[PDB]
Amino acid sequence: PLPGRQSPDHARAEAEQLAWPRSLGLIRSDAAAERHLRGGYADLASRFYPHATGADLDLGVDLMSWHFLFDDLFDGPRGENPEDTKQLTDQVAAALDGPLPDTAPPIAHGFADIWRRTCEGMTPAWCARSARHWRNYFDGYVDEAESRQYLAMRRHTIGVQPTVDLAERAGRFEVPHRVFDSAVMSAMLQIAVDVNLLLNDIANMVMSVSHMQNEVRARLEQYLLLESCLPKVGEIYQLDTAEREALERYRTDAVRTVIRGSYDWH
């Protein structure tokens, strides 16, 4: 029961989506470019971030471009052994701690360019928290290669939280940090991850399909219950007028869009 939304600048972002991964060496052949265009990644970004246009939306497109290019590196033998996965994830995650050496693989220089644009203009505490989400994301790939109630691993490697984080950056706002840590928002974000998790496996948790549709419906029904608590949650944390509007922006442009945007994309 969430409205479908798409950025009014989706046509420009989709037409120009190939320029960034090509100039960073992520896409090297015309065949790989066409394989990228078939993913509809700029289309997905325009639905995750309908509130973003121009360069803000381009950053969202690049994040979607990078995530699926990065996830593709573990389809082969590397994603089968944990030591081989961590060797690559450590090189990429190193961009959170400082500049990368020029010898780093292009997929790492791509992440560094995204993270540079992501943190710029946000509070230092927001970048630190977003950096922790990235490390959970990279650690998730190591934990899944080790394995080669599955939510514990997929809840980090699905990449929903870094996707939600960029909705704040693309929207040039920050949810009040003490509300982000709240038990209510934590439960809302958990539903957003679980819903993206189940819709992805249906489009592996199947191990039936009617049970997941009820689980998605039950979680989305509980999500609306949690949304109604937000007026009282705002008073509990004594939000002023700006913080209250930022929380509302987080509810509609970050959490709701990551739930609805992936369903419409599928």
From Swiss-Prot:
GO annotation terms (biological process): antibiotic biosynthetic process
Effect of D71E: 150-fold decrease in activity. 20-fold increase in Km for FPP
Keywords linked to the UniProt accession: Antibiotic biosynthesis, Disulfide bond, Lyase, Magnesium, Metal-binding
Superkingdom to which the source organism belongs: Bacteria
UniProt entry tagged with the keyword Metal-binding: yes
EC id: 4.2.3.7
Gene3D superfamilies the UniProt entry points to: Farnesyl Diphosphate Synthase
UniProt binding sites for Mg(2+) 1: D71, D75
Pathway: Sesquiterpene biosynthesis; pentalenene biosynthesis; pentalenene from farnesyl diphosphate: step 1/1; Antibiotic biosynthesis; pentalenolactone biosynthesis
GO molecular function: metal ion binding; pentalenene synthase activity
Activity response to pH changes: Optimum pH is 8.2-8.4.
Pfam families: Terpene_syn_C_2 (PF19086)
Record-listed Mg(2+) 2 binding positions: D71, D75
SS bond partners: C119-C127
Homology family: Belongs to the terpene synthase family.
Free-text domain note: The Asp-Asp-Xaa-Xaa-Asp/Glu (DDXXD/E) motif is important for the catalytic activity, presumably through binding to Mg(2+).
Protein name per UniProt: Pentalenene synthase
Organism expressing this protein natively: Streptomyces exfoliatus (Streptomyces hydrogenans)
Gene name tied to this protein: penA
